[PDB]
Design an enzyme around this catalytic site. Structure first.
Site, short mmCIF file in Angstrom:
data_model
loop_
_atom_site.label_atom_id
_atom_site.label_comp_id
_atom_site.label_asym_id
_atom_site.label_seq_id
_atom_site.Cartn_x
_atom_site.Cartn_y
_atom_site.Cartn_z
N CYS A 87 0.90 -1.05 0.07
CA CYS A 87 -0.07 -0.11 0.05
C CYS A 87 0.75 1.20 -0.05
O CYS A 87 2.28 1.26 -0.07
CB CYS A 87 -0.92 -0.06 1.05
SG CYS A 87 -2.17 1.35 1.15
N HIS B 102 -3.38 -4.73 3.13
CA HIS B 102 -2.10 -4.95 3.65
C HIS B 102 -2.16 -6.41 4.02
O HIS B 102 -2.67 -6.86 4.99
CB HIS B 102 -1.88 -4.21 4.93
CG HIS B 102 -1.85 -2.61 4.88
ND1 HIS B 102 -2.96 -1.88 4.30
CD2 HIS B 102 -0.75 -1.84 4.58
CE1 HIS B 102 -2.61 -0.71 4.21
NE2 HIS B 102 -1.26 -0.62 4.76
N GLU C 202 0.40 -8.52 4.41
CA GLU C 202 1.47 -8.66 5.42
C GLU C 202 1.12 -9.04 6.87
O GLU C 202 1.63 -9.63 7.40
CB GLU C 202 2.48 -7.70 5.56
CG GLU C 202 3.26 -7.44 3.93
CD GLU C 202 2.71 -6.98 2.87
OE1 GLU C 202 1.57 -6.24 3.15
OE2 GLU C 202 2.78 -7.10 1.80
#
Lengths: 562, 562, 562
Positions: free
Chosen positions: C399, C526, C528
């Site tokens: 992002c 996101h 992650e």
């Protein structure tokens, strides 16, 4: 008139001696003279029933009794001395407080702490104010040091007594300075100091206000943390001290000439100044700082201490002997050899740490003598000195070694096996050195063999007499309790064991010397504490000069940067 | 430039107003002008969610909104007034601290408390410094008072803020003065003060140092305790204040002319002084102090409060009315009559505290009107006012009485039994006075009927209009929320119930008067708080003058002390 | 019934997340379920007026609003989640304390702090006690964590609140545990801890008594200091914790099986236990700890962060992605490349630190995308992504990169130079991505584009859809405020820039993909933070699998130590 407090550290043995010595030599270089008064916030005297060496280096450097532990660097750096009224502790004060309330001077009234305890300290400051040492008349600045610990239970009357001397005079006579250590992180790396913000809360909670800047580091850190302490103390941002002391003394005067503190204290207390080059004379310290970092040798010198960590048997010894060794331009390398794990406690267990120790002392040049703590080592100290004498290696004159020097000499030259250690279990028949106190004047009964004694030599040409300009009566002090019997020295006179130094009664053999050896020094006093930068010591300096005899080095430089 | 802090007391309602008023009138008598800024360490405004009266006397003495509790004596003694920026409390500060951190003026930096709170108080002091009241240009001395309590958890940033203004200027601008009450035990006898030695420890535990002498007593004590505070504060023994305040204000200037404090503060801060007789003008206070203690009458005067102890309904009312009563040379004896235990809670239980209270009001001359605390009294207050009107006794105009005055008038002159209490249960059909807020400009919705309103009279010859020199529009403030309905006043016009005072819309009948009565005063404003020493109040002064009409007393004295 | 406090650290960003997560997974492995309630001693939410990233890692991991900073490891390790009633701070409590005192619930009585503040915290603990998460009914153990700082000014009411729940029940329900860091010397070597003896004085000065043992280290120290803390705390000598945490999580369970703490807390609070191998199940953690230290690759992976020190942009990102990378048996090497010194501030000054940066990103394989801090970097982030696409190097979907991805695509494929940065100066004509808030339901006005939104894909065969078992509607959260205009995407449809992911309105192009590239991933969410150990992330896992396609490694081991 002038009273500036000096804050040491939080533990006796961290490095407060170099910090307090920096403020003492400042006024000495400007043409003034000061004193040195400290206080130990403990129980009683450290040299009483406590061990002779464990946490504090106790000696006898110019004193007729017992000393503290951080008074050897003051006499060597400054031109002042210490007497019996300088080792002020909590035990010495209690000797008269109980006596004054029992005899009857205040009508026997029950007191508490004020205004009696806080006022009793005033008699200890106003008496040593106009009574300096043998070298000045009346010091104008009377500083008071604070050693040992700081901030405990007995710290309450100390704060109430410091404000009494300040409220009676002007504000231009006192400068408060506490202590704040700078920790180092292990994960990040930002020098975030914690005791700084915690020390301000303790001063505000008792009636004090910090005005100076206290810090301690090892390398020049960035300027991102210099403005952090200024706002927390409301002081000047250009007055932050960034000391990067490592392990010497020349890391202090190079900082005062960059920040700007040599002229701040002059106009703060309105004092005189003898300007010449930069406030105080600096050429005296620059000649000993630049020349020190220009010598090298890396010679294998095996020494014997007590343990493996930083003990208290050579904290002030390795520093004084290094300055006097600059005349020969040679550097000595100090190692760590423990005498405890060397006897039967190592060969019978694991011979791993035993063979590597003998591979560094046989190829060395200077072997020292340790000491003795009860029964924590007595056999390894005997084999360490007899091996160096047979391998034509010279020795030095170290105390606490006369009891073991007579053992190896009677077994190698003759064969007296019964003569063993007499300071542990006195039961042998051939006890040469026993425990005999002073039976003359001054000290009566079982005391200690020390004090202001006159040492008179006997011979003439030697190695520890020709360096003093051929004297006749040198004033030296000792620190032992065992004496040599004059009736058991019959076998020492019929051999090559002369005596180039006796006493004033010709009975005590304090100085011994073995003939035939190229360089054998052995005595009882401690010449290491008297290692002045302008006067080298007898023993350690004579060994290097009589080794290679290299004196044509001064004519090779010729001042390159002139 | 000059900032002197004023320490009040430990509880709101002990007598801290007379102490702070003494330091305010000191510079006013020397030809200077000052202000009055206070701060409450409580939560917020007391007149918000708390009861209107219980611990703090809340009024409307010259203000367009809410007031504090100790601002009535400052306007009467000094020549200054109070506005909306004088009732500074902890609740008013929190209204902008939460707003500035939510909008974003300091980049939204998340901090702790400093340096944001310490700098926020600086905006409240430097703004009221050059903005006094309507009577001066710029006051040179800006004092800050500290009321409410002292020694709280919230008082920590207050210590760090007081030292900020002192460390930036010289030491001749601030004088710290804490508080130390002197208790008197009923067992021993020696005035051993305890809060004195305890207040010094609190100042040393934050970072302050006491310099002045604070004390409070009620009788001249011996000189054996005057030197006890001097050694504990390191001050002068001839500067100890021994105040013996009882219950008035003239017990303060008689002490400053004996110890020596009127000239100590002049040379301490280097200020001007208009010398004439003794530093400040004293002839103005001596004419009102000695003349007060020379009158007597002991007349039976009945007053109604709320409880039997010292409440907050007449703390500043009985003091202002006593000074204005010196023109008639008559003394009023105040009693204690409780209106709570008078209804059915006493007549049905034990009739002991009921018939005794009526024995001190049937032959009295001044009967007052209490108020109303929810539902803790509504029947006893009705029979107390109608009993005095039938026995041709005069009354006074007190607020919170218009709801009960219309009940006894409709039952005696007519016979309206349905008209009862409307402030408790508004369910009756003949509800004359109901709860109607302001529907005009300024206040919108359900607010309170108060503020800077213009009161215009209607008639001319009366008893509360001829004393103001025949005015036409007097500025008066109210403190109520119930209004009279203009549609239910039909029976008040066809009888002898005129209206000698209306409003600017000719709708609200704030002033009512009953014809035929010799002296009937009834209104809504509070003339007791405006009892100036140079201007007597309308109601209570006209009752004594119209009683005996004794005016030939001033010609009998003729100035004895000539 | 059970309440155990958890003490974090002294600064938000040191390593308190791994310590608090160890006590949470203890009861989860024994068959029980707990919660996670923390408290921030700061001002308010860090994601409000403060910068989005500087000291605390703020994200949106399963939440409809704002989060804290240490709530990502709890959802990944344990089986619980976080909602809106978990980010308890000092600012959230003050939102109702000011409201309850202004409306009127306690008669508006003027109070101080107790018993109101200590009782207000009871409502925040007894309400989240029986209301866990979507996975359990009622947790028997309700632990309360303490993040941020500890010990300051607001810490006084926290001590009075902890003892309230203890004095009402038995002593077998609470275990006090403070915090004491172990410093490391830089000259000696003995681990002399200082905060240990200082933390005991703070607990005794408020009304607490330490019972547990708190420590923190990195290597197994000697046993000479384990008996030093036992005598200072008067606890058991065999219960000293010697944690040697480095930088992971497997350095904790290996210690509990050696000292003996897994069975001490069972009989201390009388709780159940499901014994099988060793109290709790350990085979689940041993398979992920031994297998992790058996892989290696040392591949050059150039990443872009923000600064050069430990920031808050990858504290919880580099830990979650490492566990999911164990399926391919490959190790990624992370470097430090600052995006600030890369633009014109380096080439125009010194080109020393500029040429060495390009020599590590051209020969790499995975290039990430940083973010954006106002105007502290905007040109270097554009040239870093266009160079990897031309050199056939794949990228990942990060992002805060959609604003710069449309700039390099319009200049290389076409030639739109006017399209520049829009988040700094919105004055260009070709502004593709601008700032448009949500104009639908829920959020009204200028808010932030985040919350529980439904993400619906458009295509089918791709690289970020086939790993979820061919879904149709995945619930993902975002954390941005800029949206793409549907009227300026005319040139994105006529080229090879498809959209394999839209929204529920078919207007916002949150997922973009460039055709022809071998591996191009770009989106807005996101992935992650959702890197679960049992479910690898879409982008970073697909790059390694599509690189060498090495899947014949599992058949080569065959369990050697079986």
């Amino acid at each position: 008139m002038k009273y500036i407090l000096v804050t040491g550290g939080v533990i006796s043995g961290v490095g407060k001696g170099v910090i307090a010595s920096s403020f003492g030599t400042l006024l000495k270089s400007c043409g003034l003279d000061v004193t040195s008064i400290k206080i130990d916030p403990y129980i009683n005297i450290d040299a009483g029933t406590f061990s002779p060496y464990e946490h504090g280096e106790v000696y006898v450097l110019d004193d007729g009794a017992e000393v503290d532990l951080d008074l050897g660097n003051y006499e060597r750096f400054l031109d002042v001395t210490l007497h019996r009224d300088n080792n002020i502790t909590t035990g010495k004060i209690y000797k008269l407080v109980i006596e004054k309330e029992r005899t009857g001077e205040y009508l026997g009234k029950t007191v508490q702490v004020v205004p009696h305890i806080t006022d009793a300290i005033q008699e200890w400051v106003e008496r040593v104010a106009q009574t300096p040492v043998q070298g000045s008349s009346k010091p104008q600045v009377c500083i008071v040091e604070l050693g040992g610990t700081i901030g405990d239970i007995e710290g309450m009357p100390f704060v109430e007594a410091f404000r009494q001397f300040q409220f009676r005079v002007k504000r231009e006579n006192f400068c408060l300075a506490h202590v704040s250590l700078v920790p180092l992180p292990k994960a990040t790396g930002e020098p975030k100091t914690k005791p700084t913000q915690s020390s301000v809360r303790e001063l505000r909670g008792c009636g004090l206000s910090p005005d100076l800047i206290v810090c301690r580091s090892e390398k020049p850190i960035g300027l991102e943390v210099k403005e952090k302490i200024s706002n927390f103390c409301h002081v000047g941002p250009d007055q932050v001290i960034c000391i990067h002391d490592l392990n010497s003394i020349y890391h202090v005067p190079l900082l005062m000439e960059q920040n700007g503190v040599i002229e701040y204290l002059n106009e703060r207390l309105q004092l005189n100044i003898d300007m010449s080059k930069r406030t105080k004379c600096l050429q005296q310290w620059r000649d000993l700082a630049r020349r020190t970092e220009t010598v090298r040798r890396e010679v294998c010198i095996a020494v014997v201490g007590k343990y493996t960590k930083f003990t208290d048997s050579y904290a002030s010894v390795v520093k004084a002997l290094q300055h006097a060794a600059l005349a020969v331009n040679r550097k000595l390398e100090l190692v760590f050899i423990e005498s405890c794990l060397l006897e039967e406690e190592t060969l019978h267990s694991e011979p791993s740490k035993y063979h590597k120790e003998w591979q560094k002392l046989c190829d060395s040049h200077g072997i020292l003598v340790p000491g003795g703590f009860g029964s924590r080592g007595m056999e390894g100290k005997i084999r360490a000195c007899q091996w160096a004498r047979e391998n034509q290696k010279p020795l030095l004159g170290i105390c606490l070694g006369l009891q073991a020097a007579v053992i190896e000499f009677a077994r190698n030259k003759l064969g007296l096996k019964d003569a063993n250690t007499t300071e542990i279990d006195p039961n042998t028949a051939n006890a040469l050195v026993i425990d005999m106190p002073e039976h003359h004047t001054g000290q009566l009964g079982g005391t200690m063999r020390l004090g202001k004694r006159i040492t008179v030599f006997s011979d003439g040409p030697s190695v520890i007499r020709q360096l003093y300009g051929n004297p006749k009566s040198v004033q030296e002090r000792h620190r032992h309790r065992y004496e040599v019997n004059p009736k058991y020295v019959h076998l020492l006179e019929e051999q090559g064991m002369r005596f180039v130094g006796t006493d004033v009664d010709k009975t005590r053999m304090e100085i011994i010397e073995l003939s035939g050896h190229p360089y054998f020094v052995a005595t009882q006093y401690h010449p290491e504490y008297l290692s002045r930068p302008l006067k080298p010591s007898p023993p350690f300096l004579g060994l290097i000069l009589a080794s290679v005899d290299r004196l044509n080095q001064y004519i090779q430089r010729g001042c390159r940067l002139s």
